[PDB]
Design a binder for this molecule. Structure first.
Ligand SMILES: OC[C@H]1O[C@@H](O)[C@H](O)[C@@H](O)[C@H]1O
Length: 329
C-alpha cells in the first residue's frame, strides 16, 4: 500500500552499486515498499530514461546515484512537479534545487585516509625521502572526485611543498589527473605515459589512486614497465571500495591499500530516511554545511569509511560479514 520507490544506480561495472541496490531493495521491502531498481550501464541517457519512466509510473520517491551529476536537472523538475522527493545517493546531484537529502560516506575523509597511508608507509613525517609520487582523481562529472582529491591533498601538500614527495611528471591539478568514467583502462593508459615519458629514469614510489578500478589499471601499467619483481617492487598503491579483485591483489602483496565503505550501512540509511520523508518525519542529518550542489547546500548524512590493508582485511571485510572467505580468493 506504501507504493514503489525508484532506485537509479549508475552501472554494474563498479561492483559496489550492485550491493547498494540489492541491499536497498531488501531494506525497502522490510519497510513495506516495493522498488524499481535500474542500472544505467554508465550511459547517461539510459539513467535519464529510467528515471523518466519511474516518474511516469508514479514512484513515491527517487533514490538516484548519478552517472553525471549535472545531467538530471530537467528530469528532476518533472519529479518535483509530481511531488516526488529525491534522495541523492553517494554522489551529489548538482545544478538543481530539486534534491531533498544526500546520503553518502565522508568523502573528504576517504581522501585523507588514502594520503595518510602513503605518508605513514613512506615515513616522510620522520624526514625520510625523497620519494616520487603520482596522482589520480575520479571522473570530473562525479562531485565526489574533488572531495577525495582535496582530502588527500590536505595531507600531501606539506610534503610536496617541501620536496619529500615529488610529482615527477608535473601532473598535479585535478584537471590533469582526473579519470573519465573512473575507467581502469584510461587510468592504465595514463600510467603508461607517465612511466614511459616522465620516468625515463628512476621509479615511482607511491600512487594516489582514489578507486580500486583505477588502482588495478595503474598496477597493470606498472607491471608492463617492469615493476613487481624483487629487483623493482611495485610502489604503494591506494584504492577505494574493497572490490574483490583488489582484495585479492592486497592479499597477494600487490595493491597496498583500499577503503571499505559498507554498502549495507548506506542502504540502511537511505531507506530509513526515505521512509522518514514519506511519513512526514525528520530526516537524520549530520552535515548541513559541506555539500553545496551549485544551487543549495543539501542536508546530508555522512557514514564512516575504513582504511584496509593486508594487516586488517580479515577483520574489516570478513569478520564484519561483508565478504565470505572464498569470495575474496
Ligand atoms: O565508481 C567509482 C567510485 O565512484 C564514487 O562516486 C564512489 O563514491 C566510489 O565509492 C567509487 O565507487
Amino acid at each position: 500500500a506504501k507504493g514503489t520507490v525508484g532506485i537509479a544506480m549508475p552501472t554494474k561495472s563498479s561492483e559496489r552499486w550492485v550491493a547498494d541496490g540489492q541491499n536497498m531493495v531488501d531494506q525497502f521491502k522490510a519497510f513495506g515498499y516495493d522498488t524499481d531498481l535500474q542500472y544505467g550501464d554508465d550511459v547517461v541517457q539510459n539513467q535519464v530514461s529510467q528515471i523518466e519512466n519511474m516518474i511516469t509510473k508514479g514512484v513515491k520517491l527517487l533514490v538516484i546515484a548519478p552517472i553525471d551529476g549535472s545531467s538530471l536537472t530537467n528530469t528532476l523538475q518533472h519529479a518535483a512537479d509530481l511531488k516526488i522527493p529525491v534522495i541523492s545517493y553517494d554522489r551529489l546531484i548538482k545544478g538543481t534545487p530539486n534534491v531533498d537529502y544526500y546520503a553518502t560516506f565522508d568523502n573528504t575523509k576517504v581522501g585523507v585516509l588514502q594520503a595518510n597511508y602513503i605518508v605513514d608507509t613512506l615515513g616522510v613525517a620522520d624526514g625520510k625521502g625523497p620519494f616520487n609520487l603520482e596522482l589520480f582523481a575520479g571522473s570530473p562529472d562525479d562531485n565526489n572526485a574533488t572531495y577525495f582529491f582535496q582530502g588527500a591533498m590536505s595531507v600531501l601538500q606539506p610534503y610536496i611543498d617541501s620536496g619529500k614527495l615529488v610529482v615527477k611528471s608535473g601532473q598535479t591539478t585535478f584537471d590533469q589527473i582526473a579519470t573519465l568514467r573512473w575507467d581502469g583502462g584510461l587510468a592504465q593508459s595514463r600510467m603508461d605515459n607517465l612511466l614511459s615519458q616522465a620516468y625515463t629514469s628512476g621509479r615511482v614510489d607511491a600512487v594516489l589512486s582514489p578507486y580500486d578500478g583505477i588502482s588495478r589499471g595503474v598496477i597493470s601499467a606498472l607491471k608492463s614497465a617492469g615493476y613487481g619483481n624483487a629487483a623493482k617492487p611495485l610502489p604503494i598503491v591506494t584504492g577505494q571500495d574493497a572490490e574483490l579483485a583488489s582484495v585479492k591483489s592486497i592479499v597477494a602483496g600487490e595493491q597496498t591499500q583500499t577503503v571499505f565503505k559498507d554498502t549495507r550501512e548506506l542502504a540502511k540509511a537511505a531507506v530509513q530516511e526515505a521512509d522518514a520523508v514519506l511519513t512526514g518525519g525528520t530526516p537524520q542529518v549530520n552535515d548541513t554545511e559541506t555539500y553545496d550542489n551549485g544551487v543549495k547546500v543539501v542536508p546530508s548524512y555522512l557514514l564512516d569509511p575504513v582504511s584496509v590493508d593486508k594487516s586488517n582485511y580479515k577483520k574489516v571485510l570478513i569478520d564484519s560479514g561483508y565478504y565470505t572467505e572464498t569470495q575474496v580468493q
